[PDB]
Design a protein around this nucleic acid. Sequence first.
DNA 1: CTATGACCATGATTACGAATTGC
DNA 2: TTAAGCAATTCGTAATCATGGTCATAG
Lengths: 1010, 66
Amino acid sequence: RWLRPTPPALDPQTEPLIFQQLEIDHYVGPAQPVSVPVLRAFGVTDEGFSVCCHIHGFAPYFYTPAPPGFGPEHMGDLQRELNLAISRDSRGGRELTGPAVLAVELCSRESMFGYHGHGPSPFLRITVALPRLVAPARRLLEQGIRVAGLGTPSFAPYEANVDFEIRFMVDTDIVGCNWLELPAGKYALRLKEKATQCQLEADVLWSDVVSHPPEGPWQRIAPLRVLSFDIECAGRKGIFPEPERDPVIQICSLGLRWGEPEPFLRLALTLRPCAPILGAKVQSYEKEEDLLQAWSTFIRIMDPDVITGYNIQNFDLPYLISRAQTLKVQTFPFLGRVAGLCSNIRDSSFQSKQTGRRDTKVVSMVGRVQMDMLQVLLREYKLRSYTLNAVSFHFLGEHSIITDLQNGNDQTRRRLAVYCLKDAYLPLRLLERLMVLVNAVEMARVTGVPLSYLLSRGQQVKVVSQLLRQAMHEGLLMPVVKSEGGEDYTGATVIEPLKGYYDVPIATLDFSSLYPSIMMAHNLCYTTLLRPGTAQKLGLTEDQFIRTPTGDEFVKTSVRKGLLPQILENLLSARKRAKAELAKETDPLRRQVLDGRQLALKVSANSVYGFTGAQVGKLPCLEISQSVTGFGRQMIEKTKQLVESKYTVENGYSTSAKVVYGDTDSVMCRFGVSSVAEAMALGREAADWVSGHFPSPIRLEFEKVYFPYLLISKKRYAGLLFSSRPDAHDRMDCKGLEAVRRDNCPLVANLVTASLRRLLIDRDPEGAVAHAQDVISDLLCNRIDISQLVITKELTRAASDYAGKQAHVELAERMRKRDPGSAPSLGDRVPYVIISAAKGVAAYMKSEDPLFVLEHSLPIDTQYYLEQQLAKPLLRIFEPILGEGRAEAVLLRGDHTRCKTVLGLLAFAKRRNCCIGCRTVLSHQGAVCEFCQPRESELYQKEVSHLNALEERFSRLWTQCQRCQGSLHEDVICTSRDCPIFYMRKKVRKDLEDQEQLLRRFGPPGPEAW
Amino acid sequence: EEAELELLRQFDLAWQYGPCTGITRLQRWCRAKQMGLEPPPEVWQVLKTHPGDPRFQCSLWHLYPL
DNA sequence: CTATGACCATGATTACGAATTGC
DNA sequence: TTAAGCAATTCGTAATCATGGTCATAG
Ligand SMILES: Cc1cn([C@H]2C[C@H](O)[C@@H](COP(=O)(O)OP(=O)(O)OP(=O)(O)O)O2)c(=O)[nH]c1=O
Ligand code: SF4
Ligand SMILES: [Zn+2]
């Protein structure tokens, strides 16, 4: 629809180009100037034109040591290494490499690993023509033949085999989303006859570019173009949609320029004639071929930078591609920027111990960038459900019906289009509100990796990139060590608690950035690790090296500076600047998203240390990891000895303090005073006192005062939070307990939060007992919503769940009769509830889908929920304040309240009802019993105040759907399984149905036909 | 039949007769006739040549827990 | 018709494998 | 071709052992 502005008057012999790049690309090419791999770079100007840039003359290489013989110091054998062996038996050694310009170069460099000296050594630099020839050469120089005139006897290892685009960016100092400049007279626009579809197309040599480091005025962001879209399909009853039978009926698109607070384009393309919508364009077609063609032409002409959505990768784009393949439309799958290239669906998997394992499809688009917001949520955030409704409530606050809204009239289709446009608008709001893209651009500028790697890869490519960028400045080469496999080492210490309930303030002192500052201030690195022999026979121990608790020796900083201290120092300053910016916000959600930014930079700095100990990885050095955790243990026991030893009764202070807890970075010391001001004063004195026994940047700091405190086990406690004194209290802290885990029911987590509220804030155990009694009583009397009963568990890799029978695996692998095409896959979460049956050996035989127990009305196992979900967390919490008469107190508060329960041949009942007073079954329909006939005005009085309260609950719920829907004049259709509103509006109809019929036992209060 | 099942499905979604997914089909036909909006005399003449069948004398979504 | 013996099951306790959080 | 690392508390689920209760036989 709307086009980009027109590039007026660029003349290359006088004017430069200044543009900001988004994507890079590799390309094997003809039309050479009179190398074959030429590079592509796509970007945008400071105004809004689209620029493609072709870069020429770059070829991959690596290094290898020159062996000590008469060969690789003699030029005849250098060019003979270039020369091929013409023998017949060298077909395995000069064919797959063959005649390639590997070349011969002599340079003086060093290896990374260890500390041998300040002296370098000769290495050979071996270029290669193509990037897809470094793999057979590696298969032909190490295990292949290297008998060539006795120049290089096998073997010499390969060093610095890295990726092509990463080697380009390490070479020329270009980072992700960078400002690039072509100077005047260096670039030719009309040298390249147009093979792509951008406006400006330059054709430059790889030594002409200028990279501007992002800082000062070069810290801006260009006006990018962002698209979001959503589709609709018309299915059958029960049957989930399938790309060979179910047509695509509506596509809806939203588009904006980045930096402007509203969109500028709003389009909706339908398949029958429709009705107009104010604010958007509407076009209609009588066939699906025109609809797919129209969308492909719009996406070529608008030419967006970024494409977003929600689950567009695994649902939307391959559905469109398969549907275009079935209907024989040849011109659809050309969505990219290159004019002669069609797109294809390709599977990929990712797995780690940090995010688990996920299997995704990818679809190829060259030039353009994809950001599915579902994958960003699934990677960064740990939530309970990952539906669009659930995250839109958590962050903002909100198939067979559609097939008859489309086979109807055109106002129904207009309603369908407004629904689809709201769906297509929600991920834009989430992208701009959560500060996604600004943090992605800052991550790519601090680490130096492209913008497509932050959605596909892990935390290794970034630390490899930063280490290579720091390695070119002193002249070192990286080695290739690979081992399967070493052993584990010893991790962190935890101090033994003094368990219980405390009501005198405890002050928390901890170290900030512990492991990066250990690695900084004792000069630990790959490049300064001293081997056990190379100290000998030199004897200089003092101020030349140090010794660690695991046992290594490491050189002092008066000889070398390591590489990991400098990378860590850069990351630490970036996080410090993020916190300094965060210290001046007032909005809460903005304060937590800047907390998210600084959390991400601290995770990056700690993954630098975790790179070293990963024995399945790219470069492990477990000696360093052992030295780190040994220093950690030594320093925390130093802290505990010092804190408990100095402030004592004989040293003039009030009370000898005693440490109650410590977990590898923090110390919770109990001081003795019950005044929060005096505890805060002594705690600040203690933190600042103890910090002066270390190198720098090692510092201990005061952080909080808990008053009161509740310690249950290791990694399980709770307390109340004081930041200042006249800032009285902030909130609770629930570390580890049953209120922050997601393996349980909402009922149990709510009860634990409410019990700690009534028990820690108001200090009333009697209201707490009465609360827990009411929860258990309302459980047994069958008046608890089934939202509070839903359990969710993650469906991981299928073989571990083959090894032992679980409940959620049994529910998932059991398909439905309605739909063998929508079922949980690997990596998602399965929700279930437990119904009552008589198979007590197996709780995996009583699990059912919440919607299935909704539509089929199966009962609930209240004894399962009473003794297996609720009871034992309560016995954790309520015991330490009292004795074991407290277990008997809650099991007796159960006992006064356990005696009230509510619930083939079962169908042949009714035709009479039991007495309302004393429950005696009898012949006839009158409500009262003949012995309890007198007391009847009181028994009518009783239960009409129950009908009165059910009437008041019907009306508050069924008009809330009208305000959440938007309209007051049309029907509600919302079966949202993540809304408590749904199925709480279903049971009050039946309560009212039952309670209205019980009062017609009594006669009518008058006539009605008068 | 199979042509009489689309006439009723077309009467059920025309907005000028009312917002009807809680009641029967013949009750909505007589409600519009009282106010006399314009009920057509064909959605009546198939609700008379049938008995109490639940796929003629019921709204489209008379399943569906809404 | 009772008493004794055998079988059978059922319930409880202990030991191992698995989602999430602490580092 | 790509992956951040390990220590666990903790509770659930399954299996094994013990204990009694019921039924059938024999005197
Ligand atoms: C959270 C976390 C901690 N650790 C280690 C490194 C840390 O130095 C040590 C302390 O944990 P943390 O206190 O969580 O982190 P931190 O002390 O480095 O930073 P800050 O005080 O500002 O919050 O635990 C990891 O190795 N990986 C991790 O993911
Ligand atoms: S059931 Fe009602 S309140 Fe709940 S989400 Fe649906 S429309 Fe909104
Ligand atoms: Zn009675």
